[PDB]
Every structure is written in structure tokens, then in C-alpha cells.
Enzyme design. Structure first.
Site, PDB file in Angstrom:
ATOM      1  N   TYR A  19      37.693 -52.057  23.327  1.00  0.00           N
ATOM      2  CA  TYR A  19      36.749 -51.071  23.886  1.00  0.00           C
ATOM      3  C   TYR A  19      36.084 -51.536  25.186  1.00  0.00           C
ATOM      4  CZ  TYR A  19      33.624 -47.051  24.032  1.00  0.00           C
ATOM      5  OH  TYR A  19      32.967 -45.900  24.409  1.00  0.00           O
ATOM      6  N   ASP A 240      53.690 -41.479   9.810  1.00  0.00           N
ATOM      7  CA  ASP A 240      52.913 -42.664  10.047  1.00  0.00           C
ATOM      8  C   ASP A 240      51.750 -42.692   9.052  1.00  0.00           C
ATOM      9  OD1 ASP A 240      51.184 -44.587  10.826  1.00  0.00           O
ATOM     10  OD2 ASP A 240      51.301 -44.179  12.988  1.00  0.00           O
ATOM     11  N   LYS A 269      47.720 -51.697   7.700  1.00  0.00           N
ATOM     12  CA  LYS A 269      46.296 -51.731   7.355  1.00  0.00           C
ATOM     13  C   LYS A 269      46.016 -52.192   5.916  1.00  0.00           C
ATOM     14  CE  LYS A 269      43.897 -49.106  10.902  1.00  0.00           C
ATOM     15  NZ  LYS A 269      44.683 -48.138  11.740  1.00  0.00           N
TER      16      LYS A 269
HETATM   17  N1  LIG Z   1      29.899 -45.149  21.318  1.00  0.00           N
HETATM   18  C1  LIG Z   1      31.245 -45.167  21.165  1.00  0.00           C
HETATM   19  N2  LIG Z   1      32.051 -44.423  21.972  1.00  0.00           N
HETATM   20  C2  LIG Z   1      33.395 -44.437  21.832  1.00  0.00           C
HETATM   21  N3  LIG Z   1      34.036 -45.173  20.896  1.00  0.00           N
HETATM   22  C3  LIG Z   1      33.345 -45.962  20.023  1.00  0.00           C
HETATM   23  C4  LIG Z   1      31.876 -46.009  20.107  1.00  0.00           C
HETATM   24  N4  LIG Z   1      31.455 -46.861  19.135  1.00  0.00           N
HETATM   25  C5  LIG Z   1      32.556 -47.320  18.480  1.00  0.00           C
HETATM   26  N5  LIG Z   1      33.334 -46.988  18.735  1.00  0.00           N
HETATM   27  C6  LIG Z   1      34.461 -47.874  18.490  1.00  0.00           C
HETATM   28  O1  LIG Z   1      35.731 -47.328  18.902  1.00  0.00           O
HETATM   29  C7  LIG Z   1      36.711 -47.711  17.925  1.00  0.00           C
HETATM   30  C8  LIG Z   1      37.943 -46.818  17.829  1.00  0.00           C
HETATM   31  C9  LIG Z   1      38.435 -46.904  16.378  1.00  0.00           C
HETATM   32  N6  LIG Z   1      38.457 -45.586  15.757  1.00  0.00           N
HETATM   33  C10 LIG Z   1      39.823 -47.539  16.274  1.00  0.00           C
HETATM   34  C11 LIG Z   1      40.547 -46.953  15.055  1.00  0.00           C
HETATM   35  C12 LIG Z   1      41.432 -47.933  14.271  1.00  0.00           C
HETATM   36  N7  LIG Z   1      40.709 -48.691  13.265  1.00  0.00           N
HETATM   37  C13 LIG Z   1      42.140 -48.891  15.162  1.00  0.00           C
HETATM   38  O2  LIG Z   1      41.511 -49.875  15.640  1.00  0.00           O
HETATM   39  O3  LIG Z   1      43.353 -48.639  15.360  1.00  0.00           O
HETATM   40  C14 LIG Z   1      35.972 -47.648  16.607  1.00  0.00           C
HETATM   41  O4  LIG Z   1      36.521 -48.614  15.713  1.00  0.00           O
HETATM   42  C15 LIG Z   1      34.535 -47.993  16.971  1.00  0.00           C
HETATM   43  O5  LIG Z   1      34.248 -49.364  16.586  1.00  0.00           O
HETATM   44  C1  LIG Z   2      46.035 -48.417  12.693  1.00  0.00           C
HETATM   45  C2  LIG Z   2      46.990 -47.377  13.170  1.00  0.00           C
HETATM   46  C3  LIG Z   2      48.133 -47.792  13.831  1.00  0.00           C
HETATM   47  C4  LIG Z   2      48.191 -49.135  14.528  1.00  0.00           C
HETATM   48  O1  LIG Z   2      48.121 -50.267  13.673  1.00  0.00           O
HETATM   49  P1  LIG Z   2      47.849 -51.729  14.322  1.00  0.00           P
HETATM   50  O2  LIG Z   2      48.074 -52.800  13.278  1.00  0.00           O
HETATM   51  O3  LIG Z   2      46.424 -51.803  14.784  1.00  0.00           O
HETATM   52  O4  LIG Z   2      48.781 -51.924  15.493  1.00  0.00           O
HETATM   53  C5  LIG Z   2      49.215 -46.932  13.891  1.00  0.00           C
HETATM   54  N1  LIG Z   2      49.180 -45.692  13.283  1.00  0.00           N
HETATM   55  C6  LIG Z   2      48.052 -45.275  12.627  1.00  0.00           C
HETATM   56  C7  LIG Z   2      48.022 -43.931  11.975  1.00  0.00           C
HETATM   57  C8  LIG Z   2      46.947 -46.115  12.568  1.00  0.00           C
HETATM   58  O5  LIG Z   2      45.809 -45.713  11.921  1.00  0.00           O
END
Ligand SMILES: Nc1ncnc2c1ncn2[C@@H]1O[C@H](C[C@@H](N)CC[C@H](N)C(=O)O)[C@@H](O)[C@H]1O
Ligand SMILES: *Cc1c(COP(=O)(O)O)cnc(C)c1O
Ligand SMILES: *Cc1c(COP(=O)(O)O)cnc(C)c1O
Lengths: 421, 415
Positions: A19, A240, A269
Site C-alpha cells: 500500500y 479462483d 490463503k
Molecule cells: N484507508 C485505506 N484506503 C485504501 N485501502 C486500504 C485502507 N486501509 C487499508 N487498507 C488496506 O488495503 C488492503 C487491501 C486488501 N483488501 C488486500 C486483500 C487481500 N488480503 C490481499 O492482500 O490480497 C487491506 O488489506 C487494508 O489493510
Molecule cells: C489472495 C488472493 C489472491 C492472491 O494470493 P497471494 O498469495 O497473495 O498471491 C488471488 N486470488 C484471490 C481471489 C485472492 O483473494
């Protein structure tokens, strides 16, 4: 043996995050020990550490499975060698996934498993004398990983394709799939697919729940339509399930809500119970045979089918199967629903929705993390909102009281969204 | 639920994709316990399990690092949290890598760390207001991983279809400044399109086990600086002493702008990689627009993998590793020397703890594998190469056994 202050100092200077991060010093069951104002505090992992910790942290059965494996063998190369943990895990996975999936290719991450799924699909059609079938089709709002190919099927606006394209493979996007079932959507999808059928290797989607693209749910019936559309136009179907797998949506796999089997499937995951990175790509016998009968899929990955990560996954999968996981998820869903109901009446809240062990408060603006984070921590909960979403995916081991503690903190975060200065 | 070797094979045969396999039942030190005609036999891991097991398997210090961490915290998400194994590892890595690399981005595999490097380079030039700098340049014979972007810079032949990068000819073994001049000339033609040059320094691994004079890396560094192209070194294979320097970059005294490590990072316990960049790269990207280099990866900076990696790196640094590798190099040279006179052998070459016999034809794995196993050695040739990258803990007697099996496999390819 660094102090929290030394950790923070090193991290500020040298660590890139996705991020100022909070120091975590421990994790046990559903609880994290975090450093706040120089003092340790216990907070619930309402995120399951990005949807991985289904049995909590430091579960005795998973800890032991790892220590036992560590004793006999940490790792050997999967080139020319096989082992028990891979064999046990492969057998478990083929048995519990949708019917027809009998072949397992291990990798180290969800995004790489998606790349593998794409190579399978492309090599499949090439082995049929149809290498022009090389594009992927999906619907908008999706997320499939952070690698270049996985990015090409992620949502184009949420993924900022505009400043990544001409560098991204050009794929085919249908509109956002709606929540409620509308046969007109599937009919338009078929009509778009039909135009591209001769250049399409596969349709790739997240079934039932779209996670990192916006926590959107859709009627399982759409999956029935995609299965039928793909079959008639000779396009493979890829699910997926990296986020939806292992009970998270209230079925073992979200495909099960529709009673459909894809040709290829990705998991990750929760696979290892959040101990270690591991992912897998499954395909049918027809997919595997056509590829292997064809003129030569991957040279690695180096750590393919890692014994340690495979052993803990076996333990994690068996732990899930050996309990009434369906009742457990149904109870968590009921807890989330009752706990989040009050959020509906809040001024900045546009929707509250629950699917299995997934609880979502959708807000009318982006959530301010500098407000949200300390407010949830003040309430004994680790929450990480993204975009306009306050959401949880709690460990399956959360007690009814812990669940309400989580939802209560979510409501409180939304209230502040909310109002305000 | 507790499988027999015959059952492992049946299950594997029916349901496992590999890159008939031999069943491994144990590993400790430099030795694997493999099942041959029903029997558990111990054989040398001459490959270090695809170049990862540098301190051997089940090293008490690395095992202990893992068991210690597991008792405290298996894993937390790296989105908004940090932790001690990540901090400890990032600090070690910044200290031991070529000077100037001060930012660490962890990932779960080498191929991903390479895509992360490419994303840094692309976002870098966007942050410089130069978004037309988007292509990569490399030289032939390379390998960077199996993912789609990573494959775009792998050797074009052997490995739209499908991301078209700039390729210089195969870098030669001996130093010829004319090679470097033609490299510069080609790069100059594309400079305004190019984000980065990406190469393996000193040793190209999965693309042919080819060595090249370190001065080429010196030239590349100067070429890149003059033409405003970033230099990326992929040290996923070469890292952590393997070539006789701590990092292969050290053989030329150069720092790249971005660097990738993996494989031996964890001592071969667990999948972990990292991409490091300089402060100028980090600041230029972070002051830039988009945000979101990654989301991504879920298991980023895994406490368990980071912890074992700290122990592994510290183990390496806590000893005279340089002398150890020199002794290994000397042992490989002496043991493979014989092979040069064989009918099918084109070349014999050694670089640090890497020993290579190149043949004038493909090696038959159905012949090579059983032949080295009968000699108490696990060897996996590829294409026309019989090679080893043994653990650092291999004794002179284990090296002689490995090299002896290697010469015999080479002797058989000609037969
Ligand atoms: N204020 C914000 N604006 C935009 N994105 C945010 C904000 N705060 C958090 N998030 C972070 O953005 C990340 C995006 C996640 N949904 C990633 C999803 C999944 N767990 C992955 O890493 O593949 C979240 O895990 C939050 O920790
Ligand atoms: C988490 C996510 C991925 C990516 O997995 P990583 O281990 O972070 O590379 C792919 N597809 C979906 C639907 C996911 O939620
Ligand atoms: C091993 C290798 C890779 C790929 O790493 P994986 O973990 O297998 O994805 C990348 N670059 C080089 C130089 C390698 O040797």
C-alpha cells in the site's frame, strides 16, 4: 531480541509494506499481542491475518504437525522426487474439491497458482491445435493477485490498468456481476463471450464472493450460467477460490453453492491455516491429459510442494473436516448478522451484508485508516478496512462473545466514519 | 493419513503434477533418505535441493529458530503490522548486500520478487515523469522465473505471445570489451523505452550454467548510469556465498539499483524471497502517484520464514564462509578434472561451490539418475549439463563422492 522501538526504527528505515505499522509481538488463538503506546495489548484478529488464520494462531494440532515434519525433513526438490506430505495433501484436496478435479499442481502463492491456471488453459488449447485461444475473460470487480498476468484479469479501475497497460495482457471484461440474479446479465455475458470465443482460452472468476475487489456477493446461479456458457462455446472455466475456499462462505468451496465444477481451480490463503505460504492449482483429467499428450508447464517453482507447508496444510484440512465445520460457519454468520444489524441505521453506512464467515459494512466514503485503526484497537480488535469497507473474516474458533466484540468494534468504526470531525 | 512408499507413489501417480519420481522419506545434513527397490537408502544432496540447502537439511540452529518462533507467533498480516523477524532480516539483508540497497520488499518466491523488481523500475520512471520507460533489456541465456513477466526475459529459445523485451547476445565467458560496446550500442537505440537492464551476475543458472567475466557487470553499471537505465541483478541463484563471494555482484564491486534474492535465503526450509532497492528508487516511487506497488502478497514477510532466514544468514556470516567455499571450489575442480578427456565432454568448469560438466548431447535422465543413485548421490542433470551445487557443509570425502558420480554419468552419456 529487539525492542518494539528498535523494531519500529528498523522498519521505518528498511521495510516496504503493501500500500506507521503497529508492532506485533505474539499471536495465540484468535488473539494478537500488539504494542500500543509502549504497552502490549491483546486484540482479536478479526481479519484472520488476511483471511488465513481459520483455526487461530498457534493451534496445538498445526504447531505439532509442523514440528513433527521438521524432525524428519524440511524440504527436498520436487523435480524427480516425491514425498508423503505432498501425497497426503493432494489426496485430501482432490477428495474435497468439486467433482472432476483430480490433478494437483502446488505453488508458493495465490498469484502464482493463478498464473499456473492460465498456463494450463493456454497449453490445453494449444494441445488441441487451437493456440489462438489465448485470452482470458472475466467480469469486473475481481482480484486474482499481484503478478503481471494476474493483474490483467483484476478489476481495471481498482487495479489502475491505465498506468499498467501496454504492459498488461489485454483481456475481455464483462460488466460487474450484480448481487441479485438477473438472467439478462448472463445473456449479455454469453453474447460477449461468443464474439471472442475463438480467441478465448478461459473464463476466470471468483465464485460467489469477490474479495479484494470490493467484498461483493453474487447469486450462485450465475456460476451455473457460466458453466453452461463455457461448455457450449468450448471455453474453459476457472474458479479462483483462494479467498472463498475451506468453508469461508458457508460451504466447503463456494462452487458448492451452485453445484458446479470448474475445469481448473485455485486455492491458497486458508490452505495452511495461515502458517505458511502455499497454494495449489487443480484441474480435470481431461485438462491434464491434453496438456501432457501435447508437445511440451513450469520449470519450478523452487519450493514446489514444500514438505513443511504441505504437512501443516494436511493438519489444517483434517482439523476442518474432523469437526462440524458447517454448523460452526452457520453460527458465525448468525453472530455477524446480529452484531452488524445496528450499523444499517448509521448515516455513513450504505449496506451491511454477510456471507458465511464474512461480515461487511459498506460506507458512503473511503474509510480513514488513521481514524479506524486506533478506534478498533481502543475496542480490543484488529480491523483493517480498505476503500469504503469495514469488514471482518474472523477465525472459525471465535466464540460468540468474541464475534460480538468484533462486530461491536466494526459498528463503532462505521459510526466514526460517520461523524466525523 | 500415514502413507507407505508404495502408497505415496500410487497417490502421486494419480494426482500430482511435477515440473516416475523417487520417494524421499527423510533429509538430514547433506544427505537424503530415498526409497530404492523398497529400501530406505541415504544419498548425497549434490543439488542442495535446487540450490537452497546451503547449511544442509535439519541444521540444529535453523530448526531451533523455527521452533522458537512458532511458540511465539506463526504469522500476522504485513498490512499495518510489523514484527521482529521481518525487522531482523531486513536489517541483515541491507547490511550484507552491495552498498546502497537500503529498502527491502519481501515476497514468497523468486519469480514474484522479479516481478516486484520490474514494478519498482516501472513505477520509478513514472515517478521521474518518464512513463515511456517501460521495457526490459537482458542478455541471452538467462533465467528469471516461471511467471509471465519473468518469462519475458528468460532466454527466448528453450523456455500476443507474449511481452517482447530487448535481448543482447549471449554474454561470453572471457572478457571482450567489444561485447560491452555492442551492448551499449543496442541499449542506446532503446534507452528512452527502457526501464531496466536485468541480468544474473557472474553465473547464469537454469539457462545453461554459464559463467562470465565480472568486468561485464562493471561495464553494465557504467552503461546504465550514463544512459539513465536502472540496473537489476537477479541473485536468486548466486546469493549467499554460492559463487565464492557473498553476492556475485561483489566479484565486480558493483551495486545494482535493484536486487533479487531467494532460494538459499531460508537455508532451504521455506519459500521466501526479497527485492531490495536503493533509497533513490524507494523515495522516487513513494513520492510518486499511484501507491500500490503490491496488495499483496498475503504471506508477505512470514515470521516463520523470516526467522529461519535470520538464523541461516547469521550462520553463514558467523563462520569463515569464504574459506569454506574456496575449499569446496578446489574439491570440485580436482574431482571433475578427469571428465575433460571424455568423448562427450565439451567443457568442465567450476565457480565457487558450483561444478559443471558440459556434454555434446543431452543427458538421458533415465540413465543418469539410477547411475548416480547406485553411487550414493542424488544428481539431476538438465539439457546437456551434469552439474552440482552441494551444501557448504560437504566434507572433502563427500565432494569426491559427488564428483566421482558426476564423471561416471558423463562417461555414460558418451558410451
Ligand atoms: N484507508 C485505506 N484506503 C485504501 N485501502 C486500504 C485502507 N486501509 C487499508 N487498507 C488496506 O488495503 C488492503 C487491501 C486488501 N483488501 C488486500 C486483500 C487481500 N488480503 C490481499 O492482500 O490480497 C487491506 O488489506 C487494508 O489493510
Ligand atoms: C489472495 C488472493 C489472491 C492472491 O494470493 P497471494 O498469495 O497473495 O498471491 C488471488 N486470488 C484471490 C481471489 C485472492 O483473494
Ligand atoms: C530460482 C530462480 C528464480 C525463480 O525463483 P522461484 O522461487 O523458483 O520462483 C528466479 N531467478 C533466478 C536467477 C533463479 O535461479
Amino acid at each position: 531480541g529487539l525492542t518494539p522501538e528498535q523494531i519500529i526504527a528498523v522498519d521505518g528505515a528498511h521495510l516496504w509494506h503493501p500500500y506507521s505499522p503497529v508492532v506485533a509481538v505474539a499471536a495465540h488463538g484468535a488473539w494478537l499481542t500488539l504494542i500500543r503506546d509502549g504497552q502490549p495489548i491483546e486484540v482479536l484478529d478479526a481479519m484472520s491475518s488476511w483471511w488465513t488464520a481459520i483455526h487461530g494462531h498457534g493451534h496445538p494440532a498445526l504447531d505439532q504437525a509442523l514440528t513433527t515434519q521438521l524432525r524428519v525433513m524440511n524440504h527436498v526438490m520436487f523435480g524427480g522426487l516425491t514425498h508423503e506430505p505432498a501425497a497426503r495433501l493432494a489426496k485430501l484436496l482432490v477428495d474435497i474439491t468439486p467433482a472432476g478435479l483430480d490433478t494437483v499442481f502446488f505453488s508458493d502463492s495465490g498469484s502464482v497458482s493463478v498464473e499456473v491456471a492460465a498456463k494450463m488453459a493456454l497449453q490445453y488449447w494449444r494441445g488441441r491445435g487451437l493456440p489462438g485461444k489465448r485470452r482470458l475473460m472475466t467480469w469486473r470487480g475481481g482480484y486474482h493477485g499481484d503478478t503481471f498476468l494476474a493483474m490483467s484479469i483484476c478489476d481495471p479501475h481498482g487495479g489502475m490498468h491505465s498506468l499498467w497497460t501496454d504492459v498488461l495482457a489485454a483481456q475481455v471484461f464483462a460488466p460487474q456481476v450484480p448481487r441479485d440474479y438477473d438472467p439478462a446479465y448472463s445473456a449479455a455475458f454469453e453474447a460477449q463471450l461468443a464474439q471472442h470465443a475463438g480467441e478465448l482460452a478461459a473464463v476466470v472468476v471468483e465464485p460467489v464472493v469477490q474479495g479484494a475487489g470490493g467484498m461483493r456477493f453474487h447469486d450462485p446461479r450465475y456460476l451455473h450460467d457460466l458453466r453452461d456458457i463455457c461448455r457450449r462455446y468450448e471455453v474453459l472455466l476457472i474458479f479462483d477460490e483462494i479467498a472463498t475456499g475451506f468453508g469461508r462462505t458457508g460451504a466447503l468451496f463456494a462452487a458448492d453453492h451452485a453445484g458446479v465444477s470448474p475445469d481448473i481451480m485455485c486455492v491458497g490463503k486458508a490452505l495452511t491455516g495461515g502458517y505458511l505460504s502455499l497454494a495449489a492449482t487443480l484441474c480435470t483429467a481431461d485438462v491434464a491429459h491434453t496438456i501432457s499428450a501435447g508437445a511440451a508447464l513450469m520449470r519450478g517453482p523452487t519450493f514446489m510442494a514444500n514438505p513443511l507447508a504441505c504437512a501443516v496444510s494436511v493438519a489444517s484440512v483434517e482439523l476442518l473436516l474432523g469437526q462440524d465445520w458447517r454448523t460452526r460457519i452457520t453460527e458465525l454468520a448468525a453472530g455477524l448478522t446480529a452484531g452488524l444489524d445496528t450499523a444499517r441505521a448509521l448515516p455513513a453506512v450504505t449496506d451491511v451484508r454477510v456471507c458465511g464467515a464474512i461480515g461487511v459494512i459498506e460506507c458512503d466514503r473511503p474509510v480513514d485508516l488513521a481514524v479506524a485503526t486506533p478506534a478498533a484497537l481502543d475496542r480490543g480488535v484488529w480491523l483493517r478496512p480498505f476503500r469504503n469497507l469495514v469488514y471482518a473474516m474472523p477465525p472459525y474458533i471465535c466464540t460468540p462473545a468474541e464475534i460480538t466484540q468484533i462486530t461491536s468494534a466494526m459498528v463503532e468504526v462505521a459510526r466514526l466514519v460517520g461523524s466525523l470531525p
